[PDB]
From Swiss-Prot, chain A:
Forms a ribonucleoprotein complex composed of maturase bI3 and 2 dimers of MRS1 that assemble around the bI3 RNA. It comes from Saccharomyces cerevisiae (strain ATCC 204508 / S288c). This is Cytochrome b mRNA maturase bI3. The lineage of its organism: Eukaryota, Fungi, Dikarya, Ascomycota, Saccharomycotina. Residues 1-257 are annotated as: Maturase. Disulfide bonds: none annotated. In the N-terminal section; belongs to the cytochrome b family. Mitochondrial mRNA maturase required for splicing of intron 3 of the cytochrome b (COB) gene, containing its own coding sequence. In vivo splicing requires the formation of a ribonucleoprotein complex together with the imported mitochondrial RNA-splicing protein MRS1. The complex seems to stimulate the intrinsic ribozyme activity of intron bI3 through binding to and stabilizing specific secondary and tertiary structure elements in the RNA. Residues 1-257 are mitochondrial matrix. The gene is BI3.
Swiss-Prot record, chain B:
It comes from the Eukaryota. Keywords: Membrane, Mitochondrion, Mitochondrion inner membrane, mRNA processing, mRNA splicing, RNA-binding, Transmembrane, Transmembrane helix. This is Cytochrome b mRNA maturase bI3. In the N-terminal section; belongs to the cytochrome b family. GO terms for molecular function: electron transfer activity; endonuclease activity; oxidoreductase activity; RNA binding. Mitochondrial mRNA maturase required for splicing of intron 3 of the cytochrome b (COB) gene, containing its own coding sequence. In vivo splicing requires the formation of a ribonucleoprotein complex together with the imported mitochondrial RNA-splicing protein MRS1. The complex seems to stimulate the intrinsic ribozyme activity of intron bI3 through binding to and stabilizing specific secondary and tertiary structure elements in the RNA. It comes from Saccharomyces cerevisiae (strain ATCC 204508 / S288c). It is found in: Mitochondrion inner membrane. The keyword Mitochondrion applies. The keyword Transmembrane applies. It is a multi-pass membrane protein.
Amino acid sequence: HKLNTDNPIYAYIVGLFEGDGWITISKKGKYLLYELGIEMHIRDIQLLYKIKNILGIGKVTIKKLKMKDGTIKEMCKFNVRNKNHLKNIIIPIFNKYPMLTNKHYDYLYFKDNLLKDIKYYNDLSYYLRPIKPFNTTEDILNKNYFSSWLIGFFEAKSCFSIYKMKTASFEVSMNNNMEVMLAIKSYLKINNNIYMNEFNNSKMTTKSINDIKNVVMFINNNPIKLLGYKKLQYLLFLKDLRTITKYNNYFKIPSKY
Amino acid sequence: KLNTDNPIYAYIVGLFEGDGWITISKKGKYLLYELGIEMHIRDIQLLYKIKNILGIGKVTIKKLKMKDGTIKEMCKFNVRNKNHLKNIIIPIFNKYPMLTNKHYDYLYFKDNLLKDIKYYNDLSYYLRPIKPFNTTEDILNKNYFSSWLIGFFEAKSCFSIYKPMNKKMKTASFEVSMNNNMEVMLAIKSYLKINNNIYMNEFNNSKMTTKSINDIKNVVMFINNNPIKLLGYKKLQYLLFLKDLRTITKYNNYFKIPSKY
């Protein structure tokens, strides 16, 4: 039979791969390599096995990076290279819950070529990701799987931090995709968000007490959950937030997640 | 080991708890273990979705030969393979436990299956406890209640629009079929902030009903905002309900009825 895709966690997966993964076609001599992949830190290796498990396809590997200094850094990776697996599992998932940013174009190209069985590099047309945003902030807000996509995006690109009395902030690393950032600001009713640019490291942040409450309650009330390290950071964040007077009193920081 | 992080499995448990069964039955000296569910033909596509989501099981059509000479139809989905039950079904129900007394059927089913009981003679006696397993507060404390609720609504809720012959205009009502689950019914009333519900008993038809504009508002928004959706006929009934609800002045003026589910 075919892949049933009415399950929201597949939207969470798209969010995760849109944030930190990739779906490309590359030149392997006179042949082509099609690959859906994602690389994360060792702290998220279990998350990659979870992905492998949910998708039923793929391979989890560990890569050793030879640093300049002579040391070795580690990363873990999940990828799918089997053409039939891509056509039967991945295509249907992304068709059902397409990516939100311009990265979506990478998908259409990947898909068009894959389904046409292009295998020699010389039969492959030229491609450069468009600079125009595929969707407007309102097209995003009209998508009924936004909140699910968002947990996967947060899993990959959000950050919870408590710093020195004390203050709490929620940030989302952006890679010039304001339409998505505005959809998030709106959907979550975040008011005191300040944008930044630290070494072209553009991000969106907020520390106000109500904004934090809104973020915590959206994350907490969503049936779609953080699965890897990001979940631990979140739970540690709450653990801390409970000790900060102005926050723990302003609302009921939940104890179950 | 099966990954059970997907809340749609809680929806599945919610659906089976409402219209399904998980039992051990005799077959002479042997024992049949079965997770099963029977629905009307209108939901045959839904059974196929369950099948593809669980990755196991079989869908069949049953012909009930009535005494009047007519053949009535129903469709069914079931899992009988011991390995499939141990490796898929057990982990799901362990992760997202049923909420009513029916949960006892599960524990019983699971203890025997794991102990590898094969003969009816080795089967200890069993009668589903009468006292509820959970309290309303225990229910409200489960973090997967809202996902379970959709599967349970898929099976036991009912959206109806109609014009009684004693009132000039149509009324909107949401009802949930009862079955000795008042602790669960109270958790729903509480969780959905329902304030004008009434109870029915039309031919032992214990159920909960509400027609108040605010109650209906709460139900429609809960359903529409949930990432976990109605997948079968119930969904179609839900969508036809909204389309009509839009034409009833008192409900339409009270709140913004969603146009996309």
